[PDB]
Amino acid sequence: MNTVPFTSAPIEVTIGIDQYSFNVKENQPFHGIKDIPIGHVHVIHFQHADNSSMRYGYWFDCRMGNFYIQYDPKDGLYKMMEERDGAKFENIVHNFKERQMMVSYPKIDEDDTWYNLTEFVQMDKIRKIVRKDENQFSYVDSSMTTVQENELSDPAHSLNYTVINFKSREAIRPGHEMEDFLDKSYYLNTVMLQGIFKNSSNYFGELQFAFLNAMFFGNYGSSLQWHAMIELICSSATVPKHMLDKLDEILYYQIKTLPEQYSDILLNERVWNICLYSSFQKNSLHNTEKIMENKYPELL
Amino acid sequence: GAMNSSNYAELFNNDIKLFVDDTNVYRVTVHKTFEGNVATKAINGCIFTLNPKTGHLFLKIIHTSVWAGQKRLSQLAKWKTAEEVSALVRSLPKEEQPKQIIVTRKAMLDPLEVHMLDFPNIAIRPTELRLPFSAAMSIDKLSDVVMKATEPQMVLFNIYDDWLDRISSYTAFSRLTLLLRALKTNEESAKMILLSDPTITIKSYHLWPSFTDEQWITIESQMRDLILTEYGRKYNV
Numbered sequence: 362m363n364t365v366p367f368t369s370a371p372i373e374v375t376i377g378i379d380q381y382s383f384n385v386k387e388n389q390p391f392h393g394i395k396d397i398p399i400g401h402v403h404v405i406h407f408q409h410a411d412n413s414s415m416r417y418g419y420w421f422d423c424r425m426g427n428f429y430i431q432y433d434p435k436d437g438l439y440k441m442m443e444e445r446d447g448a449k450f451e452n453i454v455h456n457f458k459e460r461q462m463m464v465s466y467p468k469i470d471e472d473d474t475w476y477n478l479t480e481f482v483q484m485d486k487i488r489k490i491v492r493k494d495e496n497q498f499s500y501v502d503s504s505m506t507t508v509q510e511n512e513l514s515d516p517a518h519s520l521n522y523t524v525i526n527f528k529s530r531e532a533i534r535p536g537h538e539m540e541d542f543l544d545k546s547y548y549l550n551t552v553m554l555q556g557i558f559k560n561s562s563n564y565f566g567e568l569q570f571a572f573l574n575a576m577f578f579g580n581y582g583s584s585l586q587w588h589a590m591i592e593l594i595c596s597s598a599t600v601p602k603h604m605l606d607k608l609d610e611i612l613y614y615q616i617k618t619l620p621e622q623y624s625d626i627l628l629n630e631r632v633w634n635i636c637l638y639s640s641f642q643k644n645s646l647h648n649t650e651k652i653m654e655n656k657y658p659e660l661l
Numbered sequence: 662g663a664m665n666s667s668n669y670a671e672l673f674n675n676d677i678k679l680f681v682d683d684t685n686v687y688r689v690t691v692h693k694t695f696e697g698n699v700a701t702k703a704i705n706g707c708i709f710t711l712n713p714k715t716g717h718l719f720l721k722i723i724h725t726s727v728w729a730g731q732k733r734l735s736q737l738a739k740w741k742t743a744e745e746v747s748a749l750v751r752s753l754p755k756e757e758q759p760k761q762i763i764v765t766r767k768a769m770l771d772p773l774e775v776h777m778l779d780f781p782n783i784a785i786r787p788t789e790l791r792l793p794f795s796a797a798m799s800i801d802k803l804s805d806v807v808m809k810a811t812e813p814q815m816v817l818f819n820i821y822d823d824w825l826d827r828i829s830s831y832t833a834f835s836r837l838t839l840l841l842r843a844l845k846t847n848e849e850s851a852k853m854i855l856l857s858d859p860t861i862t863i864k865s866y867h868l869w870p871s872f873t874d875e876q877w878i879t880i881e882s883q884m885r886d887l888i889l890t891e892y893g894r895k896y897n898v
């Protein structure tokens with residue numbers, strides 16, 4: 362079990378760690394989060410009490426370094442940093458634990474939610490979507506735009522998701538215009554899976570990361586990317602059976618976890634009705650269709 | 662964006678543009694089978710592709726053999742239309758290629774956009790006008806060449822005959838749409854109007870009769886009467 366210590370908490374803030382959150386008051390003696398499960402990526406995220414504008418946070422994997430949080434009064438945010446002196450870090454953490462100065466990652470033993478949401482998400486792939494190679498962790502916030510959003514403006518601060526565009530020469534083979542537009546299997550299986558992602562695990566990883574950035578930061582470009590990656594599968598007549606079964610599980614846990622009050626802005630009516638009721642895969646997503654019909658029947 | 666009453670003079674400026682109407686591409690007769698079921702029989706159709714400034718009509722005749730063995734023909738018809746328009750554009754010299762293509766039905770937007778990905782600088786546009794180009798097959802010479810075709814064929818016409826020698830494109834298009842609207846609302850009466858006086862003839866190289874300027878005014882008046890009437894006979898007013 363790993364730890365992310367905080368130097369202090371000078372401004373009142375709601376701190377999230379994966380799907381959990383807790384309020385910290387201005388200058389409340391607070392020093393961090395302990396008992397963080399090893400083996401998963403994690404996200405630690407922030408919403409200031411004075412400006413609910415800009416949720417922001419850091420994707421990290423404790424196996425890649427010792428990370429801590431320190432508030433910067435000049436830039437006005439909590440910053441993740443890496444401590445390279447391992448003895449200094451063990452000592453700081455042990456002292457804060459002895460003082461009972463860290464809250465517990467509050468995982469219920471039965472609960473596989475975080476695993477199910479991050480099954481295919483890897484830090485190395487996150488770091489290629491969020492380019493900042495001098496840090497081992499990755500900053501994301503509500504306002505960052507995607508490469509594809511910039512094509513339709515600061516490149517260093519962009520989400521380099523894989524561009525998907527159904528009306529593009531990449532998606533459409535000369536001479537198969539109708540065929541490839543109405544059945545996207547060649548775009549899915551040859552262009553994207555074999556060509557760009559190499560395997561379905563990397564495809565699902567990017568899909569899962571896009572959803573999590575949509576959910577945790579309200580990042581609109583990430584929501585667009587999540588839906589496009591769903592629609593590309595559902596609009597393909599030929600999809601490996603194991604991919605359909607895994608997609609159903611992936612989406613089930615995403616819909617299960619989504620805040621009920623955010624479904625109006627995070628779910629695209631057209632994509633979901635097309636995917637569940639009109640597409641080639643309308644009958645292949647049983648778990649997802651059942652939870653969608655019982656939890657968000659209005660959308661449909 | 663969409664073409665409508667507010668940007669109507671744009672049709673007659675000096676940017677090359679084409680209307681594409683696909684309503685006569687897939688045509689069928691519906692009939693009973695020996696068993697008392699219903700079946701369709703396709704008949705030859707056509708793509709109506711019109712330059713509204715010059716009157717040049719690229720009439721691509723769609724022979725029934727294109728449908729043999731195909732499924733979902735009404736959907737295929739849109740894609741076949743887009744394929745043929747894209748082939749037409751590629752066949753023209755660069756300086757003759759349109760800068761905009763306006764489709765009369767919004768369901769043509771995606772098929773044409775996909776077939777024209779190669780041409781990022783040609784705008785594909787819908788329209789809010791309810792243009793009467795479906796009535797093109799009420800023009801006898803156009804109907805005749807479509808029905809007689811035994812293979813795929815492109816036939817070029819000027820749908821304005823020689824009108825542009827005496828009137829502007831705006832006026833020619835207005836006359837064209839009035840004639841087609843009339844033919845669409847009441848084909849029998851519309852055609853009676855156009856051909857009643859046997860002394861006025863259709864030249865071999867023309868589609869419409871050789872009316873004098875004064876006779877066109879009378880003709881146009883009779884067509885507006887027809888359209889308003891049928892609008893009464895139809896709504897009882």
Ligand SMILES: CC[C@H](CO)NC(=O)c1ccc(N)cc1
Nearest residue numbers: 390391392393460461462463464
């Ligand atoms: C940092 C939050 C955690 C909650 O368990 N510790 C305390 O709240 C706390 C307060 C005072 C102490 N002397 C030690 C601990």
